[PDB]
């Protein structure tokens, strides 16, 4: 049973994140052409005109025209239900039929509707045509892409898109039936030939390996089911780097803070282990238990919102997870740079810009568990540190939380699961 927001929508003072807060959400760009109190043609519970009283995410509180008591109002899902802009039924040759309760209430329906609609606001004619178009994913079934090995995050494995829910892809690895769910805009998936040019560890078939090696510049062997660079959302452009892609910003051995990719509830000191090309770099979480295989190393890009300069947690009052061998109370950066004798990463190397993301503490939303991406659960914004968010799951401990960026592809507006037919995990029983 998927959790329903209905008993929580009805309550007053229920703060919910607006769709516009989510760049990756469908209908996000046309949500500004939609305002509170617009007249719409809606299914008559045959269509009838109604008014949008409240808008909480995708959920919309609607009231018929002819009902002036807030006791016959009803909640709908805007992008699912048979809602259209006014004048649509006319083109479809369908007559607007008044509800049974008010069918005798007014004398001249002409001057009533005319009065209600004269100078009234409504949706653009091409509104829901832009919704369904925004529902589609850039990826299709059968596409092959390099993505981070969840059993060895130091390398990327060749995988295949075997299931698409909205814009969340299920990637099945090549040598296995094991796999993981992932949003198309997430930075853990990469086009064919990404690890080859970047310099990232790659696990793939022997033929694929030879194929990447045999390739010389812009002419590499590409197959019909290969996902190429045109389908992958980046936080940067190759214009910002030279031809060879050799970066000179970060250097090996630099120390910084970073979100633990394996435990999203923790920001920890991290070490620049290997500097790859085009700003990509392999870092290691310092709290990680020792490993000499380097298989615990993880790839963050230098323009990632999930890496921070040292002291970022102290300044913004965040409980920083100490490195291995250090205790909570007894940890300072000055004392830690004294021990290792390593320079902290420059403040200039980090470029953090806080957008008008409009996220406020208390705003309810639907969030996906990173450590079990099959689940998208009921959540709530706990903290707003600049552009960094701290998302909490309703009905769980504060250690199950996760530090997500405001523009993460793992957060969704309320009613998203109902829109894309995904199962929404609610609070425990």
């Amino acid at each position: 049973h998927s959790y329903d927001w209905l008993p929580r929508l009805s309550k007053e003072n229920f703060n919910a994140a607006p769709v516009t807060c989510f760049p990756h959400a469908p209908g996000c760009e046309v949500w500004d052409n939609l305002g509170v109190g617009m007249k719409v043609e809606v299914e008559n519970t045959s269509f009838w005109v109604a008014t949008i009283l409240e808008i909480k995410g995708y959920k919309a509180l609607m009231s018929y025209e002819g009902f002036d008591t807030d006791s016959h109002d009803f909640w709908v899902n805007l992008c699912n239900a048979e809602v259209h802009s006014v004048g649509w039924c006319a083109t479809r040759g369908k007559p607007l039929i008044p509800p049974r309760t008010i069918e005798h209430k007014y004398k001249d329906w002409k001057d009533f509707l005319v009065g209600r609609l004269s100078g009234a606001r409504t949706l653009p004619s091409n509104f829901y045509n832009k919704i369904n178009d925004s529902l589609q994913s850039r990826f299709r079934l059968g596409l092959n892409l390099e993505c981070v090995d969840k059993d060895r995050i130091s390398q990327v494995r060749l995988a295949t898109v075997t299931k698409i829910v909205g814009k969340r892809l299920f990637l099945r690895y090549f040598d296995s039936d094991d796999g993981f769910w992932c949003h198309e805009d997430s930075p853990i998936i990469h086009p064919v030939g990404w690890a080859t040019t970047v310099g990232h560890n790659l696990a793939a078939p022997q033929d694929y390996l030879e194929r990447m090696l045999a390739g010389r510049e812009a002419m590499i062997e590409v197959h019909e089911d290969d996902a190429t660079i045109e389908l992958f959302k980046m936080n940067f452009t190759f214009d910002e780097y030279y031809s060879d892609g050799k970066t000179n910003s970060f250097v090996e051995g630099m120390k910084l803070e970073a979100v633990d990719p394996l435990n999203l509830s923790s920001i920890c000191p991290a070490t620049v282990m290997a500097v790859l090309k085009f700003g990509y770099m392999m870092i290691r979480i310092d709290s990680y238990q020792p490993d000499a295989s380097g298989s615990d190393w993880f790839c963050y890009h230098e323009k990632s919102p999930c890496i921070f300069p040292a002291g970022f947690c102290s300044v913004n009052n965040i409980s920083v997870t100490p490195p291995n061998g250090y205790d909570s109370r007894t940890f300072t950066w000055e004392g830690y740079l004294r021990d290792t004798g390593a320079v902290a990463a420059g403040q200039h190397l980090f470029h953090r810009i806080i957008p008008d993301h409009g996220f406020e503490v208390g705003m309810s939303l639907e969030c996906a568990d990173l450590m079990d991406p099959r689940l998208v659960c009921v959540a709530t914004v706990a903290r707003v540190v600049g552009r960094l968010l701290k998302v909490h799951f309703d009905g769980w401990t504060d250690e199950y939380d996760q530090w997500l960026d405001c523009e993460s592809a793992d957060i969704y507006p309320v009613g998203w699961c109902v829109l894309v037919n995904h199962k929404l995990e609610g609070p425990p029983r």
Binding site: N33, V86, G87, P95, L96, G119, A120, L123
Partner: peptide, 26 residues
Amino acid sequence: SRRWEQKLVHIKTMEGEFSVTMWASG
């Protein structure tokens, strides 16, 4: 720039038809 525009809409009922002018964001 996003601005308001006048949209002539039609409404069908038994047994006639009429038109009203509304606003839409574009």
